[PDB]
Amino acid sequence: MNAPDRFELFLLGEGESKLKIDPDTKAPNAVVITFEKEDHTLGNLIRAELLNDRKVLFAAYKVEHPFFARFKLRIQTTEGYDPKDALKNACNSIINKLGALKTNFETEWNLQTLA
């Protein structure tokens, strides 16, 4: 009855975007980015790669409710470093690592004879 359609977990609703960034007034040079139709799968990955950065002072996500598939990621970088730049670098590093892993797994699987 009240159970929502499953495709709402990954399909963007009408009139809303994947990302929305709002500056955070608690601390300087800090943003809060709302990711829509996402979950812990991307959240923990992005958070870890952001914390791998040296100029990221703070980076943490939260899924405010398991009902709705969206999460808020707070990112605060040092002075003179745009938080969107930190997000860009984290995403770039994740993509590079995933590509290297895919290449390595393909090469390793090509070495089998009992498959």
Partner 1 sequence: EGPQVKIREASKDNVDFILSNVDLAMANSLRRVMIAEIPTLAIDSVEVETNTTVLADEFIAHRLGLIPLQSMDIEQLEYSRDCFCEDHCDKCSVVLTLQAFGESESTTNVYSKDLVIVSNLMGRNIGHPIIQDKEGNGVLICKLRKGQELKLTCVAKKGIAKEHAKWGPAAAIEFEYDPWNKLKHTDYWYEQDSAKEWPQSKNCEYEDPPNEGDPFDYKAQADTFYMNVESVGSIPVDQVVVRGIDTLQKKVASILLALTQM
Partner 2 sequence: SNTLFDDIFQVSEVDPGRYNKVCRIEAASTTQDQCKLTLDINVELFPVAAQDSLTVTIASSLNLEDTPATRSWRPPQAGDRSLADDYDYVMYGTAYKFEEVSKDLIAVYYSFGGLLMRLEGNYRNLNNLKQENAYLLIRR
Partner 3 sequence: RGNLMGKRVDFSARTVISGDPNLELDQVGVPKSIAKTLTYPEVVTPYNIDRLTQLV
What does the binding site for partner 1 look like in residue numbers (CB under 8 A)? 6-7, 9-11, 17-19, 35, 38, 40-42, 44-49, 52, 84, 87-88, 91-92, 94-102, 104-106, 108-109, 112, 114-115
CA atoms within 13 A on the CB side of 74: 13
Record the tokens describing residue 69, joined without a space: 């598939």
Residue with smaller CB distance to partner 2, 38 or 76: 76
Q: Which of 4, 5, 3, 64 is nearest to 39 (CA)?
A: 64
**Residue written as tokens 């002072």?**
57
Query: Which residues, 53 to 92, sit near partner 2 by CB under 8 A?
Result: 54, 57
The order of strands in the sheet holding 19-23 is 19-23, 30-36, 70-77, 56-62
Query: Which residues, 3 to 62, sit near partner 3 by CB under 8 A?
Result: none
- Choose, by CB under 8 A, the member of 1, 111, 114, 115 that binds partner 3: 1
Binding residues for partner 3, rule: CB under 8 A, are: 1-2, 64-66
